[PDB]
Amino acid sequence: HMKIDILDKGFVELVDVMGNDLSAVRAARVSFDKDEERDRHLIEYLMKHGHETPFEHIVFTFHVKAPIFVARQWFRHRIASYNELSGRYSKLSYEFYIPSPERLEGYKTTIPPERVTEKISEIVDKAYRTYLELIESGVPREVARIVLPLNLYTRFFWTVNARSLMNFLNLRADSHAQWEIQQYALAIARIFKEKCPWTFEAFLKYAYKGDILKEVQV
Template structure:
C-alpha cells in the first residue's frame, strides 16, 4: 500500500480536529483534504493544503481594476475574461500543496516545471522502500511510428508479458543488491552510493506546492495527449481536484485553454479562403502536411 501506517495515523489525526477559520474555505476541498487518491500501481496524490478559491481570484483582480470597473462583470464573467486575455497574476493568488508518490522517471519530467516548491524524500538520508512501477499489460506499447516521443499499439500479450517479466526481475534484482550493499556485514555502503543501483521505476515521494496559474500551465502540458501516459494520469487527477477547488476557473480553463486551438498566420489565411468557398488542398495551402492534417482534424472535430 502507498501510505505507511505512520502516515495513515497522521492523516487521521489531522482529520479529527477541524478548526474555525476566517480564510476562504471550499467544502469540496475539505472533503478531499489529506485523502490519498490512487494513481498507477503504488502512487497517489493527496491535497495537503490550499489557499484561496474562485472569489479570491476575483478579489485580487478587483484590486487591479479598482473602482472603475466594479460593476462591469459578474464574477464568472470576470474569471472568463482574465483567462481569455491571459491575465495571469490574479490566478497566481491561489496556491495548492500536494503530497505525491510517483516513479522516479515521472519525477524527472515533473521537476522540469520550475515555478513550484518541492521537498523530496532523500535517499541520502533514508532507505527507499521496495516499490517499483509495473505498467498494466495494456500500457506496454510499441514505439509510435508517427510520433518520435510517443507510444503506438499495444504489444501482443506474450511479448507484453515478457516485458513485464524483465522489468520486474531487473527491478527486484537491483533492489535486492541495494539492500545487500547497505547491510553492515557487507560493508554498509553509504546510502547515497547504494541508491545509484536502483532502477528508474522505483517510487519516490514529495511535497509539491504551486500557484494556480502555474498549475494550469502544468496541466495544459501534462494532461495533454502527447504527454507520457504515466505523468498524464497524475495530471488528470489534478484536473479533477481543480474542478472541486475552483469550478469557475476550471470551466474557463477548459473553454479557453484545453479546448482551444491556436491557428497560425498561415492557417488563418487558409481558413479565410475556405470560408469564402474556395476549395483548398494541402498542396495549395502552403501548410506542411502535418500542420494541414492537424488543422483539418480540428475543423472536423476529430482527435488529433
C-alpha cells in the same frame, strides 16, 4: 480529504489549499470586502484576455508518490515549491512501478505483454537485491542506491499556484506527454476542478492547449 490512487503504488493527495475562484476575483479588483454572475464573468474575462496574474493568488499543496521517471519530468516545472523525501527527517521506503500488460497492449511486440511485465519485475528485483547486499556490506546508501532503476517510487510535497498548475495541465494533461504523467495530471485536474470550478471551466474554454481534459470527465 482528497487522495486519488495512480499507477500501481502512486497517489496524488491534497494537503492544503489557499482560496477559491473568488481569490482571483478579489486579487483582480484589489478588494477584500460577492456576485456569482458578475464574478464568474470576470473569471472568464481574465482567462480570455490573458490576464493570468490574479490566478496566482490561489495556491495548492499536494503530496505525490510517483516513480523517479515521472518526478524528473514534474520537477522541470520551476515555478513551484518541492520537497522530496530524502531520509533525513523521515523513513525512506523502497517500491517500484511495474507496468501492467495492458500498458503494452497497442504496441506490436515479439514477446507477450505479460512477459514484458515479468522481465521488468525480474530486473528490478535483482537491482533491489544488489542494493540490499551492498547496504548490508557497509556501502553508504548514497553509493549503493545508484544501481536502483528509474521506476523507483519517490514522495514529494508540491506547492503550486493556479497559474503554474494550469501551465502544468497544458503540458502534462495531453496525449503527447508520457501515459504515466498523463494519469498524474488527470488527478491534479480533478482536485483543481473541485476547488476552483469557475477557473477550471474558464481554463478549458479559453486557455487549455491539451486534448485529454476535453474528452475525459474529471
